[PDB]
Enzyme design. Structure first.
Site, mmCIF file in Angstrom:
data_model
loop_
_atom_site.group_PDB
_atom_site.id
_atom_site.type_symbol
_atom_site.label_atom_id
_atom_site.label_comp_id
_atom_site.label_asym_id
_atom_site.label_seq_id
_atom_site.Cartn_x
_atom_site.Cartn_y
_atom_site.Cartn_z
ATOM 1 N N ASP A 121 0.113 16.932 0.716
ATOM 2 C CA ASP A 121 0.052 16.260 -0.654
ATOM 3 C C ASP A 121 -1.258 16.216 -1.066
ATOM 4 O O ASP A 121 -2.305 16.447 -0.073
ATOM 5 C CB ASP A 121 1.008 15.227 -0.866
ATOM 6 N N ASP B 186 -3.415 13.876 -2.102
ATOM 7 C CA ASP B 186 -3.910 12.477 -2.342
ATOM 8 C C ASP B 186 -4.885 12.017 -1.444
ATOM 9 O O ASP B 186 -5.433 10.735 -1.025
ATOM 10 C CB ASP B 186 -2.798 11.198 -2.050
ATOM 11 N N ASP C 259 -5.501 14.372 1.391
ATOM 12 C CA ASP C 259 -5.472 15.184 2.795
ATOM 13 C C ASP C 259 -6.479 16.327 2.869
ATOM 14 O O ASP C 259 -6.895 16.670 1.873
ATOM 15 C CB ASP C 259 -3.976 16.019 2.547
ATOM 16 N N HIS D 102 21.613 1.477 8.225
ATOM 17 C CA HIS D 102 22.025 1.523 6.755
ATOM 18 C C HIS D 102 23.579 0.686 6.882
ATOM 19 O O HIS D 102 23.881 0.449 5.500
ATOM 20 C CB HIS D 102 21.816 2.518 5.886
HETATM 21 MG MG LIG Z 1 -0.882 12.503 1.977
#
Ligand SMILES: [Mg+2]
Ligand SMILES: [Zn+2]
Ligand SMILES: [Zn+2]
Ligand SMILES: [Zn+2]
EC number: 2.7.7.6
Lengths: 97, 1405, 85, 134, 107
Positions: B461, B463, B465, B1065
């Site tokens: 991603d 952000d 990286d 779950h």
């Molecule tokens: Mg990331």
DNA sequence: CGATCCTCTCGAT
RNA sequence: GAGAGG
């Protein structure tokens, strides 16, 4: 940058035998050591330019070979010898019998 | 880099581990080593004739080195020696010394039990230099005497000395006789003798390793390259710890040499002797049993050689298995809509630092001259020109840098240029897809740009990286990257036999928006969109609409990006060829007919556009398809727009009112249940507490409420809702998100329960004690839109934290799993005989994956013969030529009427039918539940569809085929599907077997009626299909060289890292509490003897399993019931008259029990009426069971089953008072009333079951199943009423012990499978099969641990790479092991091409 | 010693992805080092694209030695090996 | 602006949006010990030395320090110092290999031991670029 | 085939092989109440002949060590009464190929 | 005797 | 060694 174990693993999975060798040798370390044909140890007195070699104790002078291994591997084998362990490196699969 | 050597070049083929003889150390030696001081001899600037230098390497970059010269970076350094004044032990060998000492007689010097002992005889026979000695030591450690002579008398060598009881103390040995310490010089004298025959039996080698060599006489002095100097200031020394310790051992040796040939103080000499030992051993290994190490001007303690090699940032892991490398680069990553899938955006500065060494050839000389002319500062340039001799010309400094007339054979270290293959990577590298080859594209700016559809394999991603780039420096190394590692080659992955790359984010979102029936395009935009496609034919498609204005649909213009001959068909829910909802998908010849394009078509999906296009058109065409779709969609969307605001989380005034009331009714359900629980009306179900029952109910009501409120919200959202829009496309968000933002956040959980009472009897000091209400225990009524209250806020933060804590754990834990998996399967690969073998040549699988197929060439296909009714099957496959209604109509065949009647042709159609009915039976026995869709090679449906379009089949005219053409055609095709090739029976049957299931699929799809009525193929089309299957089948086979071990490991490991939540779950019912996720995966892999949730699953008698009563009976028959579980209280009264009670209640009991001595002390138990009814117990049963324990030594009376209070009265038939209180203990704790031991709780469960009906089809027929807490397989399986054929346990260790290794293996797969499946993930069968087989091949269960796989017969250098590095290496030398160097690890350590893929064969002329 | 004769070869008549890559790589290396080219390059300059051509026209004079797990080998020529892929 | 990227307006960046100053202080002192043996702040030349960095020492004044206002980049020596080896040994401090900027303030003071000690502050203005985090 | 009901004294255990070439096999009645070979998870094991083992090793260029293994005390090996060195062929159902043959050697 | 990977920066011996 | 980044 470190080409760690995890990266070494992905190159095996891809089956890139040469790229993996190149990363671990041509990039990084790679060293030429002189090996005795008898004891198979990094004993050989590398006397280059004067064409002499010789392994004392073995009384060997002709049966010598040159290997290409990482310096870290050379260092390790020496450290094992420092701990009284013989990592005898042989150049033929010869299991004789 | 180094000089030329006349000595022949050869690789390492073997490593013979061993021990140094002191005589060998002295022989090998170059230096005497007598002084502990460094190099300064009374201020003089040189080197001392003692420690470091006296003929063994210069530490001043001096071309001088004891005649050898060479200088540093050529000299390997030379070994010197050191003569120890008295013998010393070796730290690691200390344990082996004591073990050898408990095997040989002291004085006598011989093995204890040769060769008459019918234990030692069998122990001596075993082939092993470790497993033989294991049996030997255990056999003669018990022995205390040497033995005079032996039985049939038989006289042999054996003195009369008592063997001491040897014990290790600090770093010395102490012997017990029935005293005196054991000397290092003494232990040597015994070991110095022994016997060449006897010692080789106890794991030694006459040549390479002797036990006398485990004791140090002459220590090898390491050279300076091992222990180098050089500081930060050039005024002081700066020595290595190893040097300081060697000086320390010398100080200790000279001290011993002084004392010996001086005044020996008898006992004070041994004080210096014990210190020489606490130096020799402490330099090899610090951190033992004794004490640590000193300062020595440095950061205490000393490291020691042992620490140097110790894994993860140690010589093995940090320097050999991995290492820092040249031709590497790193930066922040960025996405690029305008970049091809296989490309990588390289910042100009990086392209300028990184180089490729290009040889000067006539084909490049012009380009190389220009590049050299541009130099290192202008981009298409170069730095360095290497000529003959090997001299590098530095293009940034050379005065001739502007001269240089290149010559062929020279190398130009040119800059990285557009289209160069580069290895691009994102850590962690859990996958082979995490490390892929891209085409360089040199760009401005400082980030690495990548195509959005490559984000997923890397798990990248933008952000913050960072990613890494590696540059191949060889022509073959570039070929390896372009031909094996390339991005297009990786599109369809073997992990889950499906694409790992797909259309995402903006493109996924806009492709939906573009695809709406409502979405229309005008000429102007259309023209721009068409031009945006690089593969465009230049032909404007005719507009869908031609009336008031030409108007093209979105589907139309997007179909330009789809290549021709692409067929795709789907059907979602209401899809009907007239697709009312515009759902499903129909693509014919790369033109979309109907169906909104979303995640199911254009994502990482199984049978989508991408899986199809790769298989049909190829990897290179598929990688263009990414860009083409991106280019059109990104442009259309750029012009359309897409947003999300606060308004997208807002539902109607009326919806809110309905949500508000949905919650208030849930609030009342919880109140009513509470009020009921508090009234003692709530009855608890068998197996669970009243409070557990309550909690389970409350949570369901509360979850129901969130789901109901959420569904209310989702429905209210319009198609113009941006959140709804992203959910529809499948680009971001799910139901939960809508529900939590718009309707209700819901219940918060910590450790799978609602908020706990952290304060006394309350969750927060704002509540009153004992408040079990939703609000009190963490129910968030509000939505993120409405906002949370402080109480709600805190509770949400509590739930939130549990997530971050396990995120932090389910990373370091999974990382360790992944390593272990990789290490254990490292060496497993497909050989040239289709076999699956490890480095030893041991078989794991005889055919890879059991079918010898590559996982990336396999897809889920329906097995048509398995399902449907017996009537449906008949209608689909039966051809009766001797029946007017059941022949082929003449409109299906050119021979139609010519064949009606026949007879000779019906023998062939009967042969065809019989095999199909045989298949149906076989498939129903393999796939019991009747599941038809299975991953198989060759997509027959697709091939059929391709023949239909290629040959333009008209479903009106009759075919030119014959029953012989179809029947023989399909039959011959089967004899051509090769997986193996040997002419032998073993191989021919193995081949016959591998292809069984595919031939089933093939027969079901290529049956006469299908080929004729369904497909309607011609002879032309049929023969093409026959050849297409053969060619695609042969393509689908695994390639010998495939590194399947690593593949399997990474294919299991990677999903495990993505395993979210350690807590399952299954939050509703409290009886669903089975260990899952990463904790379970760890239980399985470590082969945990003590698992958290051992459980039996009991299937009843085939009858008889629908009988709810028979189930209750088997439950009470197997559930362990003791007396403690039925008793309220026990009492001891003094009732002296045995036939007259002191207790007035009991009066009626004593009236009876006389017809159809004792003790005045009465043991009186009161039993619980409800507990006795929960279990299938009567007083008579409980009473007769107490009676059948002490029989005559106790007298038991009891009350009737109807009799109000349940009472058992007992009496013993001086010192009596204590004996009774003792009996009561045994009565309660040590008495089985009914049931099986270890089986604590048994629960009745209704299970769904697909079973064949009397008409043929599979029918859901529910069955009562018992679920256990605890395990006793052996005992429960013999209980009448069950199906001992179907009994199961998640305790695969027990299945192994009771049923065998093969059932153990099947159960081990079921286990591994379930961990993966519970997470919703899918991994191909072959990967888990390979794991399970590896854990299995030894006949037992070998764990993926240092205990399991790492102790096996494999190469010493490969085992030490995992864990217990040094100790593995110590036993290797002592046992004098040989390493084949056939494993990956030993070749990585040796810097040699491993026999993996590319190097799994030799290349000759 | 050891060797399997041409008649009795049981390994795939098909070239593996690993064989093709190593073949193309080795030949690329040769061409890159001024070795003679066995096919008419039609404006081709990249050593790899040339090796790809020599592979396509079956003018690569190399032999793949296929080792079996016992140590025996099967010699296959690039010339005989079928290139599907 | 996919998978967590963002599109920033260049025009508003030209007007100063998210622009920042960056400062880095480099420190040094004349030795740790030596009764007669003292390191010296100076501009070093030959004097047998050869252990130099270069990275041009050419921006240094006779005191071994750069004056505030001089542009520094690469590995330009910012503090010049020598260790007396009994001729000179280089102990000069280069600017961080990857950094660049203008010398902002140069502080010359004394330690409690009487040590001539220096602090050099260098100033860069960082303008929002493509791989910058917000 | 000695079918004991509760237990065997370790004294009697050291008399089991003392009379060769004959073989004695002890089975607890409790272990035989259910035939394990009828269970879903238990595939068919076929004790192959000395000559079949010879052909198997030849056909796959193997060593006994290179073959997957089965324990002497394996519930199935005991049922079949396998001796060490004997090879068994495991024919099992496969989700991949339908039928798959593995081989294990007795230890 | 194990205890994610890789990456950075800092201060102090 | 600590602080941090994905
Ligand atoms: Mg990331
Ligand atoms: Zn030698
Ligand atoms: Zn030397
Ligand atoms: Zn003796």
């Amino acid at each position: 940058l470190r080409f760690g174990e995890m990266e070494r693993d992905c190159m095996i999975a891809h089956g890139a035998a040469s790229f993996l060798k190149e990363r671990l040798m041509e990039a990084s370390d790679a060293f030429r050591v002189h090996i005795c044909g008898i004891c198979g140890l990094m004993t050989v007195i590398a006397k280059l330019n004067h064409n002499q070699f010789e392994c004392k104790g073995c009384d060997n002078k002709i049966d010598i070979y040159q290997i290409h291994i990482p310096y870290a591997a050379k260092l390790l084998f020496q450290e094992l010898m420092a701990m009284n362990i013989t990592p005898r490196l042989y150049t033929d699969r010869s299991r004789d019998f | 880099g180094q000089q030329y050597s006349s000595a022949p070049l050869r690789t390492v083929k073997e490593v013979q581990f061993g021990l140094f003889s002191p005589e060998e150390v002295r022989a090998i030696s170059v230096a005497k080593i007598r002084f502990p001081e460094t190099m300064d001899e009374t201020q003089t600037r040189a080197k001392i004739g003692g420690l470091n230098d006296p003929r063994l390497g210069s530490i001043d970059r001096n071309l001088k080195c004891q005649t050898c010269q060479e200088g540093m970076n050529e000299c390997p350094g030379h070994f010197g020696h050191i003569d120890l004044a008295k013998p010393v032990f070796h730290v690691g060998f200390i344990a082996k010394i004591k073990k050898v000492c408990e095997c040989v007689c002291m004085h006598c010097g011989k093995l204890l039990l040769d060769e008459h002992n019918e234990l030692m005889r069998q122990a001596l026979a075993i082939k092993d230099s470790k497993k033989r000695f294991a049996a030997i030591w255990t056999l003669c450690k018990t022995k205390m005497v040497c033995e005079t002579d032996v039985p049939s008398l038989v006289s042999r060598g054996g003195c009369g000395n008592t063997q001491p009881t040897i014990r290790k103390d600090g770093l010395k040995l102490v012997g017990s006789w029935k005293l005196r310490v054991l000397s290092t010089e003494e232990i040597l004298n015994i070991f110095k003798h022994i016997s060449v025959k006897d010692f080789t039996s106890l794991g030694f080698n006459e040549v390479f390793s002797r036990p006398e060599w485990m004791i140090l006489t002459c220590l090898p002095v390491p050279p300076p390259p091992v222990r180098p100097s050089i500081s930060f200031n050039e005024s002081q020394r700066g020595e290595d710890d190893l040097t300081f310790k060697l000086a320390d051992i010398l100080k200790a040796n000279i001290s011993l040499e002084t004392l010996e040939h001086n005044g020996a103080p008898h006992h004070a000499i041994e004080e210096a002797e014990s210190l020489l030992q606490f130096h020799v051993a402490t330099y090899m290994d610090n951190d033992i049993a004794g004490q640590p190490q000193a300062l020595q001007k440095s950061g205490r303690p000393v490291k020691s050689i042992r620490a140097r090699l110790k894994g993860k940032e140690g010589r093995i892991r940090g320097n050999l298995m991995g290492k820092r490398v040249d031709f590497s680069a790193r930066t922040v990553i960025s996405g690029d809509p305008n970049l091809e899938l296989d490309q990588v955006g390289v910042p100009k500065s990086i392209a300028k630092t990184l180089t490729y060494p290009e040889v000067v050839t006539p084909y490049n000389i012009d380009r190389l001259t220009q590049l050299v002319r541009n130099g290192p500062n202008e981009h298409p340039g170069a730095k360095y020109v290497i000529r003959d001799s090997g001299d590098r010309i530095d293009l940034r400094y050379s005065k001739r840098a502007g001269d240089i007339q290149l010559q062929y054979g020279w190398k130009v270290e040119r800059h990285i240029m557009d289209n160069d293959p580069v290895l691009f990577n994102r850590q962690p590298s859990l996958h082979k897809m995490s490390m892929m080859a891209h085409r360089v594209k040199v760009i401005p700016y400082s980030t690495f740009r990548l195509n959005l559809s490559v984000t997923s394999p890397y798990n990248a991603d933008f952000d913050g990286d960072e990613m890494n780039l590696h540059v191949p420096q060889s022509e073959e190394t570039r070929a390896e990257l372009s031909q094996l590692c390339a991005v297009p080659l990786q599109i369809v992955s073997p992990q889950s036999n499906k694409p790992c790359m797909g259309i995402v984010q903006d493109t996924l979102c806009g492709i939906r928006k573009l695809t709406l029936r409502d979405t229309f395009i005008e000429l102007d935009q259309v023209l721009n969109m068409l031009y945006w496609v690089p593969d465009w034919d230049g032909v404007i498609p005719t507009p869908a609409i031609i009336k008031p204005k030409p108007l093209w649909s979105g589907k139309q213009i997007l179909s330009v990006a789809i290549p021709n001959g692409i067929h795709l068909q789907r059907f979602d829910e209401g899809t009907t060829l007239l697709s009312p909802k515009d759902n499903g998908m129909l693509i014919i010849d790369g033109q979309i007919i109907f169906g909104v394009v979303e995640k199911k078509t254009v994502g990482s999906s199984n049978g989508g556009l991408i899986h199809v296009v790769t298989r049909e058109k190829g990897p290179q065409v598929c990688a263009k398809l990414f860009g083409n779709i991106q280019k059109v969609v990104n442009f259309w969307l750029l012009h359309n727009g897409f947003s999300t605001g606060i308004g997208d989380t807002i539902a109607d005034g009326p919806t809110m009112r309905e949500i508000t009331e949905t919650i208030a009714e849930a609030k009342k359900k919880v109140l009513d249940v509470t009020k009921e629980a508090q009234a003692n009306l709530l009855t608890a179900k068998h197996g669970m507490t009243l409070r557990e029952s309550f909690e389970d109910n409350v949570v369901r009501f509360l979850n129901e409420a969130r789901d109901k409120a959420g569904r209310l919200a989702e429905v209210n959202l319009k198609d113009l809702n941006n959140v709804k829009q992203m959910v529809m496309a499948g680009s971001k968000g799910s139901f939960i998100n809508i529900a939590q933002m718009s309707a209700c956040v819901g219940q918060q959980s910590v450790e799978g329960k609602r908020i706990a009472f952290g304060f006394v009897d309350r969750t927060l000091p704002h509540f009153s004690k004992d408040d079990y209400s939703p609000e009190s225990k963490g129910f968030v009524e509000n939505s993120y839109l409405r906002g949370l209250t402080p109480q709600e806020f805190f509770f949400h933060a509590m739930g939130g934290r549990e997530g971050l804590i396990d995120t932090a754990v389910k990373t370091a834990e999974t990382g360790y799993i992944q390593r272990r998996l990789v290490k254990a399967l490292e060496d497993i690969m497909v050989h040239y005989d289709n076999t699956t073998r490890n480095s030893l040549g041991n078989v794991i699988q005889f055919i890879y994956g059991e079918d010898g197929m590559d996982a990336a060439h396999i897809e889920k296909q329906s097995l048509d013969t398995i399902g449907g009714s017996d009537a449906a099957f008949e209608k689909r496959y039966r051809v009766d030529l001797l029946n007017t209604d059941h022949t082929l109509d003449p409109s299906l065949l050119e021979s139609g009427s010519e064949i009606l009647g026949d007879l000779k042709l019906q023998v062939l159609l009967d042969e065809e039918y019989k095999q199909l009915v045989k298949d149906r039976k076989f498939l129903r026995e393999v796939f019991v539940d009747g599941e038809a869709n299975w991953p198989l090679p060759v997509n027959i449906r697709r091939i059929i569809q391709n023949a239909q379009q290629t040959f333009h089949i008209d479903h009106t005219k009759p075919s030119d085929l014959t029953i012989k053409d179809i029947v023989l055609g399909v039959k011959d095709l089967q004899e051509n599907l090769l997986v193996l090739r040997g002419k032998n029976e073993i191989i021919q049957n193995a081949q016959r077997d591998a292809v069984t299931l595919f031939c089933c699929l093939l027969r079901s799809r290529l049956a006469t009626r299908r080929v004729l009525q369904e497909y309607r193929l011609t002879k032309q089309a049929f023969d093409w299909v026959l050849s297409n299957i053969e060619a695609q089948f042969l393509r689908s086979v695994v390639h010998p060289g495939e590194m399947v071990g690593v593949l399997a490991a990474q294919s299991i490991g990677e999903p495990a890292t993505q395993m979210t939540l350690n807590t399952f779950h299954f939050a509703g019912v409290a009886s669903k509490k089975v260990t899952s996720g990463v904790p379970r995966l760890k239980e399985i892999l470590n082969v945990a003897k003590n698992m958290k949730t051992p459980s039996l699953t009991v299937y009843l008698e085939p009858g008889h399993a629908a009988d709810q009563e028979q189930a209750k009976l088997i439950r009470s028959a197997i559930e362990h019931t003791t007396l403690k579980s039925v008793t309220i209280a026990s009492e001891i009264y003094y009732d002296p008259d045995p036939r007259s009670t002191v207790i007035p209640e009991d009066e009626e009991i004593i009236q009876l029990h006389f017809s159809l001595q004792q003790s005045p002390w009465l043991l009186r138990l009161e039993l619980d009426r409800a507990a006795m009814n929960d279990k299938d117990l009567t007083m008579g049963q409980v009473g007769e069971r107490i009676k059948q324990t002490f029989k005559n030594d106790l007298f038991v009376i009891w009350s009737e089953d109807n009799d109000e209070k349940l009472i058992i009265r007992c009496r013993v038939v001086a010192e009596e008072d204590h004996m009774l209180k003792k009996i009561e203990n045994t009565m309660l704790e040590n008495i089985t009333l009914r049931g099986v031991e270890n089986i604590e709780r048994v629960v009745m469960m209704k299970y769904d079951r697909k079973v064949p009906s009397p008409t043929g089809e599979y029918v859901k027929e529910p069955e009562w199943v018992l679920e256990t807490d605890g395990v006793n397989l052996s005992e429960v399986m013999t209980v009448p009423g069950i199906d001992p054929t179907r009994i199961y346990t998640n305790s695969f260790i027990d299945i192994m012990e009771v049923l065998g290794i093969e059932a153990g293996r099947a159960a081990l797969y079921k286990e591994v499978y379930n961990v993966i499946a519970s997470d919703g993930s899918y991994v191909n069968y072959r990967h888990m099969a390979l794991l399970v087989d590896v854990m299995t091949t030894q006949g037992g269960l070998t764990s993926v641990t240092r205990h399991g796989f790492n102790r096996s017969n494999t190469g010493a250098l490969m085992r030490c790479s995992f864990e217990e590095t040094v100790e593995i290496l110590f036993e290797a030398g002592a046992s004098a092991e040989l390493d084949d160097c056939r494993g990956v690890s030993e070749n990585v350590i040796l810097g040699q091409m491993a026999p993996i893929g590319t190097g799994a064969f030799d290349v000759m002329i | 010693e050891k060797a399997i004769p041409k008649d009795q070869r049981a390994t795939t008549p098909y070239m593996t992805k690993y064989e093709r890559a190593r073949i193309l790589g080795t030949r690329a290396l040769q061409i890159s080092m001024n070795a003679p080219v066995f096919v008419d390059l039609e404006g081709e300059t990249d050593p790899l694209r040339i090796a790809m051509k020599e592979l396509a026209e079956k003018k690569i004079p190399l032999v793949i030695r296929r080792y079996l797990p016992d140590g025996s080998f099967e010699d296959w020529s690039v010339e005989e090996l079928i290139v599907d892929l | 602006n996919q998978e967590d990227s963002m599109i920033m307006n260049q025009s508003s960046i030209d007007r100063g949006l998210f622009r920042s100053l960056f400062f880095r202080s480099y420190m040094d002192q004349e030795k740790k010990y030596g009764m007669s043996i003292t390191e010296t702040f100076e501009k070093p030349q030959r004097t047998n030395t050869l252990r130099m960095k270069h990275g041009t020492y050419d921006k240094l004044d006779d005191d071994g320090l750069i004056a505030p206002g001089v542009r520094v980049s690469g590995e330009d020596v910012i503090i010049g110092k020598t260790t007396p080896i009994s001729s000179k040994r280089d102990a000069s401090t280069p600017l961080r290999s990857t950094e660049n900027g203008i010398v902002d303030q140069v502080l010359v003071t004394t330690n409690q031991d009487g040590l001539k000690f220096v602090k050099v502050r260098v100033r860069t203005t960082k303008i929002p670029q493509i791989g910058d985090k917000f | 085939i000695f079918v004991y009901q509760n237990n065997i004294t370790p004294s009697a255990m050291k008399l089991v092989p003392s009379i060769p070439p004959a073989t004695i096999e002890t089975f607890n009645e409790a272990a035989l109440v259910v035939n394990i070979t009828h269970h879903e998870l238990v595939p068919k094991h076929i004790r192959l002949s000395s000559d079949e083992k010879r052909e198997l090793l030849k056909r796959y260029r193997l060593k006994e060590s290179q073959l997957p293994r089965i324990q002497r005390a394996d519930p199935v090996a005991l049922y079949l009464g396998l001796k060490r060195g004997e090879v068994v062929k495991i024919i099992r159902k496969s989700e991949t190929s339908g039928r798959y043959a593995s081989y294990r050697i007795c230890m």
